[PDB]
Enzyme design. Structure first.
Site, PDB file in Angstrom:
ATOM      1  N   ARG A   1       3.481   2.477 -10.943  1.00 51.51           N
ATOM      2  CA  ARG A   1       3.772   1.049 -11.112  1.00 51.51           C
ATOM      3  C   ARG A   1       3.788   0.640 -12.581  1.00 51.51           C
ATOM      4  NH1 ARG A   1      -0.472  -0.908  -6.378  1.00 51.51           N
ATOM      5  NH2 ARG A   1       0.248   0.667  -4.860  1.00 51.51           N
ATOM      6  N   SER A   2       2.839   1.158 -13.369  1.00 49.30           N
ATOM      7  CA  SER A   2       2.773   0.831 -14.795  1.00 49.30           C
ATOM      8  C   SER A   2       4.053   1.252 -15.511  1.00 49.30           C
ATOM      9  CB  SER A   2       1.570   1.531 -15.439  1.00 49.30           C
ATOM     10  OG  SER A   2       0.317   1.034 -14.979  1.00 49.30           O
TER      11      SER A   2
ATOM     12  N   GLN B   1       6.654   7.828 -10.510  1.00 45.47           N
ATOM     13  CA  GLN B   1       6.006   8.890  -9.727  1.00 45.47           C
ATOM     14  C   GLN B   1       6.818   9.372  -8.526  1.00 45.47           C
ATOM     15  OE1 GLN B   1       2.087   6.682  -9.220  1.00 45.47           O
ATOM     16  NE2 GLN B   1       1.250   8.743  -9.396  1.00 45.47           N
TER      17      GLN B   1
ATOM     18  N   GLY C   1      -2.073   4.768 -13.939  1.00 39.77           N
ATOM     19  CA  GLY C   1      -1.406   4.317 -15.153  1.00 39.77           C
ATOM     20  C   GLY C   1      -0.083   5.012 -15.471  1.00 39.77           C
ATOM     21  N   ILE C   2       0.662   5.448 -14.455  1.00 38.01           N
ATOM     22  CA  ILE C   2       1.961   6.095 -14.681  1.00 38.01           C
ATOM     23  C   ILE C   2       3.056   5.625 -13.732  1.00 38.01           C
ATOM     24  CG2 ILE C   2       0.931   8.126 -15.746  1.00 38.01           C
ATOM     25  CD1 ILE C   2       1.333   9.679 -13.130  1.00 38.01           C
TER      26      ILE C   2
ATOM     27  N   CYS D   1      -2.420   0.610 -13.505  1.00 35.98           N
ATOM     28  CA  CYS D   1      -2.490   0.604 -12.054  1.00 35.98           C
ATOM     29  C   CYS D   1      -3.657   1.513 -11.691  1.00 35.98           C
ATOM     30  CB  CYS D   1      -1.136   1.003 -11.459  1.00 35.98           C
ATOM     31  SG  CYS D   1      -0.318   2.487 -12.218  1.00 35.98           S
ATOM     32  N   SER D   2      -3.523   2.403 -10.718  1.00 35.24           N
ATOM     33  CA  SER D   2      -4.626   3.342 -10.522  1.00 35.24           C
ATOM     34  C   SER D   2      -4.559   4.510 -11.520  1.00 35.24           C
ATOM     35  CB  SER D   2      -4.665   3.839  -9.067  1.00 35.24           C
ATOM     36  OG  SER D   2      -5.907   4.527  -8.844  1.00 35.24           O
TER      37      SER D   2
ATOM     38  N   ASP E   1       0.827  -1.217   0.000  1.00 34.96           N
ATOM     39  CA  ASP E   1       0.000   0.000   0.000  1.00 34.96           C
ATOM     40  C   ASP E   1       0.861   1.266   0.000  1.00 34.96           C
ATOM     41  OD1 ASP E   1      -2.558  -1.313  -0.031  1.00 34.96           O
ATOM     42  OD2 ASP E   1      -3.216  -0.394   1.831  1.00 34.96           O
TER      43      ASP E   1
END
Length: 283
Positions: A221-222, A262, A218-219, A215-216, A181
């Site tokens: 983890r993706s 990020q 899209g930048i 991911c949430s 998390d």
């Protein structure tokens, strides 16, 4: 500089935040005018994460062709990826329309539906074989065929049917379920094992449309997923693997979608993953 020793030099000097801020300063800025039209407000999860106009995926629809999704085309590595946000309640039908129209084989999901007590994306696939999903706005049917639950990830086989033509296709859903998390994983070993499983399935290969990864937003983890994949592929292709410059690859990818990677912790984790992965590829 090489990667593994540039790595120890940044650790010993504690300068990850300065390296990451340099990347942010040098990154491309292109217009995203379609994303900001008022009619598209409920198609965007976050107001500060938008696809560039020049690389956005267009839905094959004349009313509204917009989805928050970008085509990342890596020319030297000969790989393409679609990076997108986690689907919203009012975009789950658009999501599967894109999968269909772009001829993708695989979907890569790097988040859980709920994290930190809040919803990070819609429940966009069926959880029981006998309870299929119908998306009436885009005329698609989606059925769970099988599910294999492992300790760090789950793989699902799904059937997507275009109800207009009665054509069907098999889609593979690769779900990494153990990203914490807060922060990043302590070891890249399970993330690399997951990447290799996606590769082994054919989902990243040129005989299919581009893989869809999310991911949430899209930048974050993706971005880590596609950056690690492309860097490892270049290390196999080139005569001199130590010439692969992860910061330069990341800046190239940021020509196609804003904000990839990020945090400075995600940058450090990407270095770690490529370094460890390069040893397994060979000893």
């Amino acid at each position: 500089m090489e990667m593994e020793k540039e790595f120890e030099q940044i650790d010993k000097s504690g300068s990850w935040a300065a390296i990451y801020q340099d990347i942010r300063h040098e990154a491309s800025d292109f217009p995203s005018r379609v994303a900001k039209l008022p009619k598209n407000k409920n198609r965007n999860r976050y107001r500060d994460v938008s696809p560039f106009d020049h690389s956005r995926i267009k839905l094959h629809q004349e009313d509204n062709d917009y989805i928050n999704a970008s085509l990342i085309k890596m020319e030297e590595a000969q790989r393409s990826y679609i990076l997108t946000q986690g689907p919203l309640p009012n975009t789950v039908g658009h999501f599967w329309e894109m999968v269909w129209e772009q001829k993708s084989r695989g979907v890569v999901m790097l988040n859980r539906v709920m994290e930190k007590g809040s919803l990070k994306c819609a429940q966009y696939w069926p959880q029981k074989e006998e309870k299929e999903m119908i998306f009436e706005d885009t005329n698609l049917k989606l059925t769970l065929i099988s599910e294999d639950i492992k300790s760090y990830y789950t793989v699902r086989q799904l059937e997507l049917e275009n109800l207009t033509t009665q054509e069907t296709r098999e889609i593979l859903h690769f779900h990494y379920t153990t990203w914490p998390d807060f922060g990043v994983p302590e070891s890249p070993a399970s993330f690399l094992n997951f990447l290799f499983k996606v590769r082994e399935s054919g989902s990243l290969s040129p005989e299919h449309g581009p893989v869809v990864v999310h991911c949430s937003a899209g930048i974050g983890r993706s971005g880590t997923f596609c950056l690690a994949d492309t860097c490892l592929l270049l290390m196999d292709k080139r005569k001199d693997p130590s010439s692969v410059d992860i910061k330069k690859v990341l800046l190239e990818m940021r020509k196609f979608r804003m904000g990839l990677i990020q945090t400075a912790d995600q940058l450090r984790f990407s270095y770690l993953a490529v370094i460890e992965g390069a040893k397994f590829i060979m000893g």
